[model samples]
Target chain A: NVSGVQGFLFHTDGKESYGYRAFINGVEIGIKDIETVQGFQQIIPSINISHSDVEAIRKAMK
Target chain B: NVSGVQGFLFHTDGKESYGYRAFINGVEIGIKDIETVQGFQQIIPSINISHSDVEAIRKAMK
Candidate 1:
């Protein structure tokens, strides 16, 4: 625990055929075996926000 | 850019053959579309470290 204003966790798992699961801070974010490269690539932002958010996390790294 | 010491980013991509890719701070981390769920699940930590990293990112979300 950062134990301060900065505390979080992420867990990731997958299966034999291509099964995958991710827990962003113990809350799950999912990916599918059914995903296609074209469709996936085309829809990248569905699960994300801006670089601003990224930079935010990076800051807390210290 | 948070334009500060705490800046970072993660980008993700995938394909039809069941593939995924990840990048943190614009540095690409590759995931095999050719992954098997069984082997993949067993190898979850292959892509990660501790709660320290996720917690750091989450703090930046604000």
Candidate 2:
């Protein structure tokens, strides 16, 4: 299985936040909005997301 | 590189539930549950769920 992390920096209400979208097979499946300076992790066990979903997310985020 | 779908049949009390987990590069990263007659989808783009997590999930589900 292939796994990796992508990080993004965002500003909301004059505060900075880090966010991550977890993906499997090109589809985004999990989202983490960092509330603190510390980091966290998420795991996926037996599923795959699709390309269409990824495109939708990218569009939604933009 | 290998991809496909696996279907399961579950029963909780008098209700029937259908769930699906998505995988990428051998790791599961997305989950979809069908509570009614309609189906849903989840996407994972670059994250993988570990085997240990799967074991935990299986144990918890039982």
Candidate 3:
């Protein structure tokens, strides 16, 4: 779907290898790579976001 | 950590997704972005890998 996730869990591996898990209102969206996530932002059809959704993500992040 | 992950689990979510998760012999190695994993290749201190370690990643992906 061409939409945005409302929540996300970004973190690092125990040894600092690093990792992240994504969410939207307590639901698992199942996104594995941040580049994929970033690509979702930088490029489209890979994924897309609305201005309001973008604001929602930024607001949720803060 | 300043080392390569010995294992990874890459996958996309349902409905034309963009996501991944990582592992090391059944252990979880968290990385949110593919760039972060790829960055482990192009850069250092962000994360690093030995020559053999990089080879291991390649073979694992293959």
Candidate 4:
């Protein structure tokens, strides 16, 4: 195992206001733009972000 | 969570005979060359490999 929290989750709302939100280790990180998700890839080389998990994270964030 | 085992473990034997070996999900894959580890990064974008685990994997491969 890689150990520790090492993944990200994101949520997207249709409207521009808070249209995108993100989380790490279940805690929401303030985000205005959705493209910042790609920014994470550079820093967390081992992190995986799957579109399949989007809905689940969306529900959890609520 | 990213789900499942998403990391790599490696062992470096001191001599050229089976000098390097690797594992994914706990099964050893035949590897003579160590550079193949980088090849995996291209394929598995989320996999994390750490030098610290080398000794543990070395012991496990026994």
Candidate 5:
């Protein structure tokens, strides 16, 4: 049967969240929740955040 | 908008078809129509198949 798998990786410092990495079928497809600094720097850092945020990011990527 | 991209890679010899590579959002997700020859030997060769077959295989995977 055909099936799809989706998930994301998040990174954060103690003070605030930073970035995220999104994947589908084990391939890095997109990212979200990147802070302004990291976004400006194009660092694309992963962040640590709530499960709901992760889900939101995943949905957004989809 | 949240949407998904799906496609497949197919390979085949003039004599017979062999295998396939399935992808979702550019990630290899699943495969299908693997012949018993390679499947039994675990070769997993991609094959040249029709678009309809590819779609069928994709739906089956899903």
Candidate 6:
């Protein structure tokens, strides 16, 4: 899990349909679409995690 | 970091505004908006990491 977060991003293709998809907190979401963001927010909290609880991780990355 | 992902999600409220926000690959994004998903896809790969490289992680959860 990313710093303790549980999720997945994978590509899919079928019958002329293809795009990035994700699995988070038992919900599967598409990464490309008109309402992708709207749907993401709904499930984001289920995986509301940060790699590090300390501020240093964010500080060092930059 | 959920599943080895490098990202952050935090809440913000100011000047009649309040919503969830995220930091990914040096980019800060607002969660309660129209273009969040589009903008997210653009930078997702920068932190495209899964918690485990094995299929077991996906299997056990289900």
How much DockQ does model 4 earn? Answer: 0.04
Model 6 DockQ (Cα-based): 0.06
Collision count for each candidate, in order: 19, 25, 11, 0, 19, 16
Candidate 2 per-residue lDDT over residues A1-62, each given as its tens digit: 22232333222232332233343233333333232111213323322334345456556554
Where does model 6 exceed 4 Å of error?
A: A1-4, A13-15, A33-62, B1-7, B10-62
lDDT tens digits by residue: candidate 5, B1-62:
01222333455444544444434344343333232122212212234666446666656655
Taking every candidate in turn, the Cα RMSD to the unseen true structure, in Å, is 15.6, 14.4, 16.6, 12.7, 14.9, 16.3
lDDT of 2 at A22: 41
Output the TM-score of candidate 5.
Answer: 0.21
Once fitted onto the true fold, the runs of candidate 1 whose alpha carbons sit more than 4 angstroms away are: A1-18, A33-62, B1-7, B12-62
Model 6 agreement with the true structure over A1-62: per-residue lDDT tens digits: 23223554444233333354445544454454323333334334322223232134224333
- Model 5 agreement with the true structure over A1-62: per-residue lDDT tens digits: 13333333343333444344444444554355356335523322232433323343344335
Q: What DockQ does every candidate get?
A: 0.03, 0.04, 0.03, 0.04, 0.02, 0.06
User: What's the best-to-worst order under TM-score?
Assistant: 6, 4, 3, 5, 1, 2
How big is the positional error of residue B6 in model 3, measured in Å on the Cα after superposition? 40
Which numbered prediction scores highest in DockQ against the true structure?
6
Reference-based TM-score, model 2: 0.19
Model 1 docking category: incorrect
Off by over 4 Å in 4: A1-4, A33-35, A41-62, B1-62
Worst 10-residue lDDT window, candidate 2 chain A: A32-41
User: Chain B alone, model 6: TM-score?
Assistant: 0.35
Q: Which CAPRI tier for candidate 3?
A: incorrect
lDDT tens digits, residue span A28-54, model 3: 333454444543332122333443354
Report the number of the highest-lDDT candidate: 4
DockQ of 2: 0.04
Badly placed stretches (over 4 Å) of model 2 are A1-18, A31-57, A60-62, B1-62
Greater lDDT among 3 and 4 belongs to 4
